[PDB]
């Protein structure tokens, strides 16, 4: 271990107050930080342990400190025989130890971590907070720093060199150690963790280790001491499933008359609230008998149970849910007065977390592997849901009709278990908004409270492909003209595909829904396919990522990413994907057509070893079928032939051990006829040579302009204008797009030396 670098601050002050860097050879001074140097590693580990005792911090953060940093330090101190290192905690006579742990759920998957013991102090690895809350494409520090802010063997010779190289290494390490602080204070992590621990009543270490059961157990016990009840222990392996939610059958297609969306807000917690459903008021089938009082003492549910009215008991789950609902309402009332966009979405994150907590209260009941299940309640909930949504659809389509004085009889096109997308008939967004608000407020008056239906949007135009797949354009007000698109479910929000395909789907829906020009859309898709086949598409747009889950399900059937991961490298059998992460790969061309798991390769390996790409795989398996989903419903099946013919005019333009034994046959630039001698033009096509020189110097001119815009961008992203660039960042498009233009220019410069020189040079 050669350098340790530390940043420290008091919470509430907008800058740090401590900035220290401890190195292992003599170094050069850095303005703003202290620098100390040692000639042996024992002094370095001792100095860090003494600093961490004396400063005595409350919280320790970092990025991947649990699974890399602390056990490396502990094992390295054990090897070098330094006895006083592993006492990092607060208790004076206690040493620390490495211990494995696993967590698994159907919500976050399964992850295996080490833990290191520190008594008194709290740990917050920001990697685990990101991996638990956020669903992203890559989880590298560079990728999340670009997504939120906007950015090994070389180091061993920056350290065996001079002291300005070591000073450069220390400035790099300090920037690395500074980035997670900025992420912690910018994303409102710690304020939301403190508010979660105050609303639920669990400690601050449980929100990084546990799930959503300890919190609902805690709140139920805290509500149970106030009336004098005790909880039982029921455990069963195992019950059966029950029936979930209804989806209404669509009227599929393309709509160009406005559809208004009406939905219920906080549906399942308000069902559980306003019909008095709880553990503590579930009536067994016999204890009603032989009392006969049915009216206003109990009710009956569509699955079949009987539940006591609120004039006898009050349940415990209504009160816990009412507290959580008021907390989320206060968070939304605070969110309704922000102007900054990233701040608006992080308050949206806070309210999303409180709504997830309130819904996991209901999901506690149906978990037959758990601590206290009561599937009768769950069945009553979803039965009430189904009954109310079909009530909504009957009522909306039945009242506003041609005989009832209105304009047109409306017709529901879609509904998915909480929402209803009714198509009204008018093509004026003001009149649709007015009637939709009247409908929402009208239908809501047929229920107990807090059951309320609300207007939410007007889509104009609309595109419905299947169940859980649609798109549209979003209206919030009228003079607020339009907000954005909505892409529910489609190929632009999933992460199982290429960036090329998601970009093409977004650009096609842009040209098709905003400008309403299908001809520019066809020309766009043609240019994408043509530039694919002509081999001028970056390999950033070709990378596919998949998650490496539990190893036995991936034992059960052969996949591509599992095959790439389990195949080690010759260079490194010590850095490879583990369980739970994401494996990136691209597909190269070969002749083993039975298996697409035999053609997958690491992006850096195909970078350094230059393997070709299977353009037919990407053409017929990645691109073609999402396009045939989207482009068909506006036209007939002559549209499938239109895009497969727009392919056909553009499919006829394709660019191209033994490879060393070349002959390098020259070819005519005009008509492609191989011939003896080095002159560029053919004897039949020699007159038209001024035009053939004119052609292709406007190509060299455009490659020259692309070299310079890229190789000076690295100088501004690096910081310095006087020293070399070293950044092989695999998540930057800049890298390997700066590598191919050198070769394009190398090739296009040599093609013009077929022609003579435009003058002498030795004069």
């Amino acid at each position: 271990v050669i350098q340790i670098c530390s940043l420290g601050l008091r919470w509430g002050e907008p800058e740090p107050f401590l900035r220290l860097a401890l190195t292992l050879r003599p170094c050069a001074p850095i303005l703003g930080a202290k620098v100390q140097s040692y000639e042996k590693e024992e002094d370095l580990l001792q100095a860090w342990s003494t600093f961490i005792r004396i400063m005595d911090p409350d919280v320790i953060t970092g990025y991947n400190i649990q699974n890399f940093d602390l056990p490396y330090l502990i094992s390295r101190a054990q090897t070098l025989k330094v006895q006083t290192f592993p006492f990092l905690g607060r208790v004076a006579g206690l040493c620390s130890n490495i211990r494995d742990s696993s967590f698994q759920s159907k919500q976050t998957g399964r992850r295996d971590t080490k833990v290191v013991s520190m008594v008194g102090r709290v740990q917050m690895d920001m990697l685990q907070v990101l991996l638990r809350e956020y669903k992203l494409r890559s989880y590298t520090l560079n990728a999340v720093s670009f997504h939120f802010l906007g950015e090994h063997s070389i180091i061993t010779d920056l350290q065996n060199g001079n002291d300005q190289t070591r000073r450069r290494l220390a400035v790099y390490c300090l920037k690395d150690a500074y980035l997670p602080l900025r992420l912690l204070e910018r994303l409102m992590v710690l304020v939301n963790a403190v508010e979660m621990a105050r609303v639920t009543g669990v400690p601050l270490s449980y929100l990084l280790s546990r799930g959503q059961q300890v919190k609902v157990v805690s709140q139920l016990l805290r509500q149970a001491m106030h009336e004098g009840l005790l909880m039982p222990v029921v455990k069963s392996e195992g019950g059966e499933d029950y029936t979930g939610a209804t989806v209404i059958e669509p009227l599929k297609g393309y709509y160009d008359v406005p559809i208004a969306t009406l939905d219920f807000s906080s549906l399942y917690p308000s069902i559980m609230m306003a019909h008095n459903l709880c553990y503590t008021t579930l009536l067994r089938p016999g204890t009603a008998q032989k009392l006969g009082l049915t009216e206003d003492q109990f009710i009956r549910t569509p699955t079949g149970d009987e539940f006591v009215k609120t004039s006898v008991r009050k349940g415990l789950l209504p009160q816990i849910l009412e507290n959580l609902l008021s907390a989320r309402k206060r968070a939304k009332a605070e969110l309704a007065k922000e102007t900054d966009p990233l701040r608006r979405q992080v308050l949206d994150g806070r309210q999303l977390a409180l709504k997830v907590s309130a819904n996991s209260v209901y999901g506690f009941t149906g978990a037959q592997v758990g601590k206290l299940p009561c599937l009768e309640i769950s069945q009553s909930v979803t039965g009430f849901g189904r009954q109310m949504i079909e009530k909504t659809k009957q009522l909306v389509e039945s009242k506003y009709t041609v005989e009832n004085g209105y304009s047109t009889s409306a017709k529901v096109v879609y509904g998915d278990t909480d929402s209803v997308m009714c198509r009204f008939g008018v093509s004026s967004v003001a009149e649709a908004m007015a009637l939709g608000r009247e409908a929402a407020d009208w239908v809501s008056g047929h229920f107990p409270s807090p059951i309320r239906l609300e207007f939410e949007k007007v889509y104009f135009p609309y595109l419905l492909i299947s169940k859980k797949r649609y798109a549209g354009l979003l209206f919030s007000s009228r003079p607020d003209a339009h907000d954005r698109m909505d892409c529910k479910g489609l190929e632009a929000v999933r992460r199982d595909n290429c960036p090329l395909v998601a970009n093409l789907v977004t650009a096609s829906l842009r040209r098709l829904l905003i400008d309403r020009d299908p001809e520019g859309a066809v020309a766009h898709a043609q240019d994408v396919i043509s530039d694919l086949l002509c081999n001028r598409i970056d390999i950033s747009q070709l990378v596919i990522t998949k998650e490496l889950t539990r190893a036995a399900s991936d034992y059960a059937g052969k996949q591509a990413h599992v095959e790439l991961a389990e195949r080690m490298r010759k260079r490194d059998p010590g850095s490879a994907p583990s369980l739970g992460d994401r494996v990136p790969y691209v597909i190269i061309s070969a002749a083993k057509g039975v298996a697409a798991y035999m053609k997958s390769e690491d992006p850096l390996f195909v970078l350094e070893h230059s393997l070709p790409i299977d353009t037919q795989y990407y053409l017929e398996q990645q691109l073609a079928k999402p396009l045939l989903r989207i482009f068909e419903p506006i036209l007939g099946e002559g549209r499938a032939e239109a895009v497969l013919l727009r392919g056909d005019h553009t499919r006829c333009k394709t660019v191209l051990g033994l490879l060393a034994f070349a002959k390098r046959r020259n070819c005519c630039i005009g008509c492609r006829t191989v011939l003896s001698h080095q002159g560029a033009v053919c004897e039949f096509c020699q007159p038209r040579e001024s035009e053939l020189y004119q052609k292709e110097v406007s190509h060299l001119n455009a490659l020259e302009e692309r070299f310079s815009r890229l190789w000076t961008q690295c100088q501004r992203c690096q910081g310095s204008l006087h020293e070399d660039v070293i950044c092989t960042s695999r998540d930057c498009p800049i890298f390997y797009m700066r590598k191919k233009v050198r070769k394009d220019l190398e090739d296009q410069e040599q093609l013009l030396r077929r022609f003579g020189p435009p003058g002498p040079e030795a004069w």
């Binding site: 006829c652 490879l659 006829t673």
Partner: protein, 249 residues
Amino acid sequence: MFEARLVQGSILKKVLEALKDLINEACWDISSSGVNLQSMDSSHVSLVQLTLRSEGFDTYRCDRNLAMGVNLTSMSKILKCAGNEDIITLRAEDNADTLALVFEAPNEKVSDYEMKLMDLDVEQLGIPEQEYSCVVKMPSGEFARICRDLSHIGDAVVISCAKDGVKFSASGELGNGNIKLSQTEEEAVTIEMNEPVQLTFALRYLNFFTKATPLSSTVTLSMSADVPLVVEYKIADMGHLKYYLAPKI
């Protein structure tokens, strides 16, 4: 304008079934010396070189050196709409990207197809001429059965050329075996040797190379130190067909 006419369309169909599995796209270099082609395979491992000399076409006419871009799958589908006795003529313009094929039955029925060509940006490679030192001339049927029979055991094969004969060995999980062949018209195995050879080659490429067996009776195998093994066939007063494959290190 290009126009050729050849009486034995069977030769054309055998050469087009030599290549429709190993290659998907090619460029025909039409000249005033014949119809010549070079290509690499899709796997970037092996080389094909095909020469149909100008004389053997029984009515030739070529004005200017052309270069046609042909999808070999569609052409292989077209040349199986012609029986084994027909007379084939090829018709092309010097301004167009579409080829005409007319098949003439030797009895009342004539057929004519038009096929759209493609423009491709391929690069043409070749070979230099050196003297391979082990020269085998053997029957093609025995070579086909030897490769196909060793194929079920394992995937590599070692060729072992010694004085009186050659010996092919191959291994695998169900064991190993060799086949000898010795010096002793076309059922003979003529063996010229200056330096002995032992080398290793993979079997999928060899079982691709033995797809063009109806073109001749004998096959010529040429080996030397550390060079790509050459498999050579001759087509009678028409030209030749060569595959090239590099040894394993």
